[PDB]
Amino acid sequence: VPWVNDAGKLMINRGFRVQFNSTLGPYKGGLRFHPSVNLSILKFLGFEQIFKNSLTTLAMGGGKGGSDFDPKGKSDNEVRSFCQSFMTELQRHIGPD
Amino acid sequence: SDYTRSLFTLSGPATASEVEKHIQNAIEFVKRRDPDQVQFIQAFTEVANGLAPVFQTDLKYLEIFLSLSEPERVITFKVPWVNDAGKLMINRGFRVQFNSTLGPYKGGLRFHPSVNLSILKFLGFEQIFKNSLTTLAMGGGKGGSDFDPKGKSDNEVRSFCQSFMTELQRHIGPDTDVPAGDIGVGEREIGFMYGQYKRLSNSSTGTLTGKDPKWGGSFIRPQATGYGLVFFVQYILNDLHNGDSFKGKRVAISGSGNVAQYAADKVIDFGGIPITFSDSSGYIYEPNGFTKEMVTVLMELKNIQRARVSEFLKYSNTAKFFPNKKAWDVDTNVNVALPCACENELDKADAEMLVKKGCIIVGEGANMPTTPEAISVFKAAKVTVCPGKAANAGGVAVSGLEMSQNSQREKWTSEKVLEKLQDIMKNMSKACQEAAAKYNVHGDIISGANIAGFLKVAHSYCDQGCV
Amino acid sequence: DYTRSLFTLSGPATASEVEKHIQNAIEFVKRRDPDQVQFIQAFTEVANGLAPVFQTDLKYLEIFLSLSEPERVITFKVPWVNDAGKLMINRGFRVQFNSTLGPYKGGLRFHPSVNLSILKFLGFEQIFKNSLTTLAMGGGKGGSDFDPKGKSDNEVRSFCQSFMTELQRHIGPDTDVPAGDIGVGEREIGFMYGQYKRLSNSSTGTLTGKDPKWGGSFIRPQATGYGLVFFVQYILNDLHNGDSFKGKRVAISGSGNVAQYAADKVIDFGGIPITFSDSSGYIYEPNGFTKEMVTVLMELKNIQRARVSEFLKYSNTAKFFPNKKAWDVDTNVNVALPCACENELDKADAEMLVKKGCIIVGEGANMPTTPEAISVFKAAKVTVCPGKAANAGGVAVSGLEMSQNSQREKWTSEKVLEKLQDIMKNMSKACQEAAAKYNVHGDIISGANIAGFLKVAHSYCDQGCV
Amino acid sequence: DYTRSLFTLSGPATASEVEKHIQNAIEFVKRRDPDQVQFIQAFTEVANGLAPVFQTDLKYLEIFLSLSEPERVITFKVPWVNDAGKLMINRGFRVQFNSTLGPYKGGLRFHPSVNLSILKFLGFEQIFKNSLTTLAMGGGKGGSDFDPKGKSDNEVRSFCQSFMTELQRHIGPDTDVPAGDIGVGEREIGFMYGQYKRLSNSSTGTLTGKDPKWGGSFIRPQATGYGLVFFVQYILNDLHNGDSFKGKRVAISGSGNVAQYAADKVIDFGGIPITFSDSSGYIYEPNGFTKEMVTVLMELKNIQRARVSEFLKYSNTAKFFPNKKAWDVDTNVNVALPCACENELDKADAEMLVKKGCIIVGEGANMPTTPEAISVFKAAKVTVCPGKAANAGGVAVSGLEMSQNSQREKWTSEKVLEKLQDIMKNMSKACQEAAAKYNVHGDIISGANIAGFLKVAHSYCDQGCV
Ligand SMILES: NC(=O)c1ccc[n+]([C@@H]2O[C@H](COP(=O)([O-])OP(=O)(O)OC[C@H]3O[C@@H](n4cnc5c(N)ncnc54)[C@H](OP(=O)(O)O)[C@@H]3O)[C@@H](O)[C@H]2O)c1
Numbered sequence A: 001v002p003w004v005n006d007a008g009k010l011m012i013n014r015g016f017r018v019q020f021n022s023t024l025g026p027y028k029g030g031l032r033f034h035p036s037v038n039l040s041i042l043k044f045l046g047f048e049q050i051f052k053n054s055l056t057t058l059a060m061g062g063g064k065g066g067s068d069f070d071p072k073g074k075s076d077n078e079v080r081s082f083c084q085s086f087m088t089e090l091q092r093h094i095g096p097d
Numbered sequence B: 001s002d003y004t005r006s007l008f009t010l011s012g013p014a015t016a017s018e019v020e021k022h023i024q025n026a027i028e029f030v031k032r033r034d035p036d037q038v039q040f041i042q043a044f045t046e047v048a049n050g051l052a053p054v055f056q057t058d059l060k061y062l063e064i065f066l067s068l069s070e071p072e073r074v075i076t077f078k079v080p081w082v083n084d085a086g087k088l089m090i091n092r093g094f095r096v097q098f099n100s101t102l103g104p105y106k107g108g109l110r111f112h113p114s115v116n117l118s119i120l121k122f123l124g125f126e127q128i129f130k131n132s133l134t135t136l137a138m139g140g141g142k143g144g145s146d147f148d149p150k151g152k153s154d155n156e157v158r159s160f161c162q163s164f165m166t167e168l169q170r171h172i173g174p175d176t177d178v179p180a181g182d183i184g185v186g187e188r189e190i191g192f193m194y195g196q197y198k199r200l201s202n203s204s205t206g207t208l209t210g211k212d213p214k215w216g217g218s219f220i221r222p223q224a225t226g227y228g229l230v231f232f233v234q235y236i237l238n239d240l241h242n243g244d245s246f247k248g249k250r251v252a253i254s255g256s257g258n259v260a261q262y263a264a265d266k267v268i269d270f271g272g273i274p275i276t277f278s279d280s281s282g283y284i285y286e287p288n289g290f291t292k293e294m295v296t297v298l299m300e301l302k303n304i305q306r307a308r309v310s311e312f313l314k315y316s317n318t319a320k321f322f323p324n325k326k327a328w329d330v331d332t333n334v335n336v337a338l339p340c341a342c343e344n345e346l347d348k349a350d351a352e353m354l355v356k357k358g359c360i361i362v363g364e365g366a367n368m369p370t371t372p373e374a375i376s377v378f379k380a381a382k383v384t385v386c387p388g389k390a391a392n393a394g395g396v397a398v399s400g401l402e403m404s405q406n407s408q409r410e411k412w413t414s415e416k417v418l419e420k421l422q423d424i425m426k427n428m429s430k431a432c433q434e435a436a437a438k439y440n441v442h443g444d445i446i447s448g449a450n451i452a453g454f455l456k457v458a459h460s461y462c463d464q465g466c467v
Numbered sequence C, D: 001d002y003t004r005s006l007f008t009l010s011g012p013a014t015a016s017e018v019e020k021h022i023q024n025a026i027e028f029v030k031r032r033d034p035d036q037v038q039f040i041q042a043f044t045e046v047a048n049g050l051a052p053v054f055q056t057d058l059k060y061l062e063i064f065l066s067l068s069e070p071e072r073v074i075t076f077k078v079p080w081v082n083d084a085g086k087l088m089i090n091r092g093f094r095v096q097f098n099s100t101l102g103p104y105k106g107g108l109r110f111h112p113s114v115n116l117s118i119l120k121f122l123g124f125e126q127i128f129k130n131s132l133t134t135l136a137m138g139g140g141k142g143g144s145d146f147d148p149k150g151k152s153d154n155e156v157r158s159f160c161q162s163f164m165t166e167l168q169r170h171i172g173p174d175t176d177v178p179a180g181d182i183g184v185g186e187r188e189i190g191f192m193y194g195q196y197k198r199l200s201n202s203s204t205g206t207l208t209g210k211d212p213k214w215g216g217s218f219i220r221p222q223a224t225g226y227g228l229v230f231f232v233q234y235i236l237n238d239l240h241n242g243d244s245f246k247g248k249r250v251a252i253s254g255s256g257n258v259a260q261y262a263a264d265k266v267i268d269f270g271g272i273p274i275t276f277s278d279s280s281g282y283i284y285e286p287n288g289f290t291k292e293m294v295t296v297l298m299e300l301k302n303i304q305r306a307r308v309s310e311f312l313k314y315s316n317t318a319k320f321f322p323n324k325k326a327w328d329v330d331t332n333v334n335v336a337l338p339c340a341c342e343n344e345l346d347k348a349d350a351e352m353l354v355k356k357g358c359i360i361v362g363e364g365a366n367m368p369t370t371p372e373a374i375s376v377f378k379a380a381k382v383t384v385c386p387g388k389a390a391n392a393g394g395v396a397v398s399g400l401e402m403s404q405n406s407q408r409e410k411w412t413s414e415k416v417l418e419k420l421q422d423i424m425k426n427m428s429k430a431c432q433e434a435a436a437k438y439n440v441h442g443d444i445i446s447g448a449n450i451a452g453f454l455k456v457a458h459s460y461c462d463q464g465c466v
């Protein structure tokens, strides 16, 4: 995820979307922006999310995603720039169904 | 002019010691992001250290290099398939789409139980810069699976290939990502995957390379790496050794596989005399050289009989075999050394032998054949070393020519493909020479290959807005 | 003709009949777009240039009218954030005028004056210039009212990325291949290419003018100047009974890329370039500029950004005349190549050139020769090669760039140059033949109008007039 | 507020300062589109109606200006072959103005007067009318200068199919859902729907106004008239402390669909409709029209296309007055419902109605009440229900049609009617609350302007101002 901060400097962060299971429905799960984020954590949350979503009785599968992007210390405009760049790639892999 | 200067935090010239520290900071940052990707960390380190002269002119290139070390896209996916017993099996599939600045992601697929993300990232990262060296419009990538072909029936490999391509087809295409073969993926696997891709996409395009000539394949594929090595060395001899040539030169070749065989054939076309071949058991030696007829016999022994080099004495009264020794040990003057066997095969002692025997140039057919200590010996002796990442790129170069033929919907003759491969090696050799002279030192082709490969990607990356 | 029944007007017509029908067409265009001053004027000028065709068959006027409506125009909001962090909104356009002969092809202009009327006039004319190249290219034009002046590199990047975020939805390697223009050079093409590649996840020839390292072509810098000389050389051969540039004194105006490379190619053909110019004046070498002298001039203009007068420091034979046009030079001139700007060659300049011995004019710039200057040349039987054909070398090489991308093969410089020369050979022959066919022999301006129009018109009817 | 830093202007301003800023905004809109007279007037009128909002925070003026640029406008040539076998070319349009709250939504107009300025003005206002419905709908408008008058059914079919051949590329059930308007009724909706389904190979709610047999909704013909009466009914309850239509004599102007169905719903609520009108005059029933009498009037107007005077043949009690407006009727009038045309209710008409006892005006037509008429009503404390809210019933039911298509379920007539009433219930409440918050209490005209705008502006900032 390349994005330009308020100082005009290019920053590069890592984005993830773990699409774990779609048996009962579309992948469903939150996005976490935090410096601690990595594949192991998102897989653990996404794996468990399959079965919590199953318990709801609704047609929802399991997934989880996010980035190591750290919101702390960032201006509103810097968050906007990262969010737009993050979704520029993510949109290719998601959708209402 | 410079349109991206404001984007970079690191900038300006730097001393050698400042660059060494910054490289350490970059390495540590890469480690923190991927603490246990040992091969990828090592790959980032080796490429970075080869670029110190560029970083000394402008530290912005180190920031660009770090940004290139993050893949644009990595796809991991479950691959379900049913074996011949009717049991469900699950394997992991990968496609590392590392960089597309110069063109579509390009890189092979490996099916082997050792495959994991770290290995595919190290191969994909280095592949960006070799593919840049071909001068062709190709990015860098790598993929595969932990699926183990050993012990599997043809039908089981077919089942896996179809399920694997069922997911991969979603992320590749003729203008996006063109995979190829590697360990565990040869013509059988390329054929099975191409059929599945064609069926799902309902199209006939050059989305894989390594295809059969009957459906989109290219000539010169078996000969590409050996021929390209000899083409590269020939041009270095003319440009850097004032009109020198392979003509009349005794050429010690190590290895007896496809690279060694076809390097010898092209050496003969250029008038050189190949005197040796080798394998893990020893080396064979012809005092007056091997002819094309003799190479043909050796090719049959290795490719059909699967014999050792010693078997060749059965066919030649002049041949001599020396057990448990390297080709570099041969007692005769050697003017050109072509290591085409494996990494670290030419050590400090071998290089010292070769200098005394009269070696003027080394051409690497294998990957990293020359040890660091051997390279230092060659540098002091003024023996040119042609780096493998440039000299053995003929195989990937022909894969690019296969893409060109598919885009043009025209199958080229053997002669046209060969001329194009030769022209690619001419421009690659000139670019390595020019980069070395401009940035580090004249005649250091190893430095020139590192610089020329990187800079084309980095400048294009800035042209494109660093996205 | 399988489309004959679709059109009401048919058969030959007198000049007065053609004028009446053209007036009815113009009025219809005015009612549709009452205030698009530039577009109405462009439709009028092209229609009047096609009178020889309309007199043979009035059906062509109805075809011309149906071509005057763009297939598709897209206007869109472009939001972007400047370096002060403030949201700015600009208007973006892509006029996809006609795709009969190939994908919509045409440049992008970033300038505060840009509006729909201007882009429609440029896009309409671009259909017929692109037709003349003989390549499979349609016609279009686009851009934005974004003003690059005063903008940082980063602000141009932000705008370019947002602009292409919308534009990518409507373009493609087989659909619409834009290029550069005023305000859109190497910087902007690179920023837009990167954004397009990221969004489409593909590496294709959807823009031309790219750097040779990623899909670009050789000869692009030299394309317009080289093509101008190729075209004049072939017109001299075809229409002036084997004549050539050899031994001819050539007055060149301008000292930019077009003038520099036109001079280089003139020398290759044995011509003698005697002048260069800029806004300050013109320089003159009585025995000509050599390739070495041109190289010195190129260094002065491209590196030092100097005036032409600086060249006198490097040549003792050179003379500088301030505040004068190259056409004023006191010597025999056989060829005039205006390569500076529109309206640089006026009636008085043309009368001078005729007296100095000028036999042919080649337009490297856009509309350099005024209407009265063209009348003087026509009455004197001095051939004028229209810019729409003669300066088409740039768009020609952009088409060759599309071929190289489709072939995924970078041609050598020599192959591109041979391809460009063959294009200019066929263009000159088609201009000559069209002029002769319609009874205005030697009128290369008419021949260029007819050849460009007719290939589009006939192909349009072949395709069912959709 | 996460978008504050993006806007240059911020903070409160006096009324005169806001007037200066609005003038600067108008001048900017004028320079961008110098000759779009209708659009400039629409921007001016909406901006002046939002002055109270701008006074609290000038950032809302910058947001309003950014909304005035369409996200996307597509213009395209429409070729079709008429019954004589001749090729005709018309211009097609789709202004996709704003999608902040949902897919672009707005009708299509086939009329020779159609141009970009008119469609932009209608599309811009459609953003805020659709916002008022509380439904997830953006704003848009489209059509063609194609003239249906004099055309055979087959020619309309040919044009509709060619028109949708291009339009389908830019619309979709989640992208843009067009509807009917002048020149585009059931016939045209059916022809276009068939073409869209064939090309897309899908059956979705990409058009509204469809027949109930294939994706259509009940209450579509009655929606605007019924919704007008619902809106006034709730305003009477909310602002006039429990008042209602019951027992009220209602002067209605016009005799088309809006007037007819408003009269029917007035009767349902216990009101007495006393007048109808057309360009020739008005008819008057001293004891009111019954539902049966309205049914006779509907047959006369929709079949036979007769004048209102023709109703006197069917009623001995009816009186006809030539060359006069309904507001002139000599009797006590409690409610006025202008359902004919813009500017039909002028200052003199408002003074008459106040004297006759009028307590509320409900606008079925677009801008029926002149500014001077509005001044008279405010002094008399007569509430005016703005058309942009009161006549939103048609677009509201178009949204309910989208919901039924998304659910693949046809609702009963009663369920659609219930949802339409609830929408008008919430719309009236939102208008009053907006007026109260900005200290224009009881000014439903301002409350409708503010509620429609603010939902879009706040959502626009929520979404990052893209
Ligand atoms: N062909 C290509 O596409 C290509 C491209 C780039 C780089 N390369 C590199 O080039 C090298 C050889 O390629 P190839 O196609 O010739 O492979 P190959 O067909 O396996 O031949 C390798 C040869 O080297 C010999 N060898 C291995 N280890 C040896 C040792 N320790 N001492 C002496 N000889 C030894 C092998 O003999 P044994 O049978 O006794 O092992 C064999 O004759 C490898 O490093 C490969 O990665 C190949």
Ligand SMILES: NC(=O)c1ccc[n+]([C@@H]2O[C@H](COP(=O)([O-])OP(=O)(O)OC[C@H]3O[C@@H](n4cnc5c(N)ncnc54)[C@H](OP(=O)(O)O)[C@@H]3O)[C@@H](O)[C@H]2O)c1
Pocket (backbone or CB within 6 Å): C224, C253, C254, C255, C256, C257, C258, C259, C277, C278, C279, C280, C339, C340, C341, C342, C344, C364, C365, C366, C394
């Ligand atoms: N190169 C192409 O492919 C291309 C593409 C599109 C259009 N054109 C047209 O070709 C012409 C310029 O081509 P170019 O690329 O060579 O542009 P350029 O590099 O800017 O050079 C233009 C030359 O003309 C001179 N000039 C401008 N106004 C003048 C005047 N009033 N009197 C005398 N000289 C004057 C300029 O000198 P100063 O330094 O004093 O301005 C400069 O030397 C223009 O008509 C342009 O629109 C060319």
Ligand SMILES: NC(=O)c1ccc[n+]([C@@H]2O[C@H](COP(=O)([O-])OP(=O)(O)OC[C@H]3O[C@@H](n4cnc5c(N)ncnc54)[C@H](OP(=O)(O)O)[C@@H]3O)[C@@H](O)[C@H]2O)c1
Pocket (backbone or CB within 6 Å): D224, D253, D254, D255, D256, D257, D258, D259, D277, D278, D279, D280, D339, D340, D341, D342, D344, D364, D365, D366, D391, D394
């Ligand atoms: N129906 C909707 O959902 C909808 C949608 C958009 C806009 N509108 C607006 O609502 C109003 C009417 O809607 P509608 O569908 O009921 O239209 P309609 O079916 O045409 O009815 C309009 C009525 O007004 C009359 N009229 C026109 N000009 C008049 C005048 N100067 N004096 C007196 N009567 C006059 C017409 O009589 P003649 O036959 O003599 O003209 C006709 O009876 C218009 O302002 C229109 O813009 C309605």
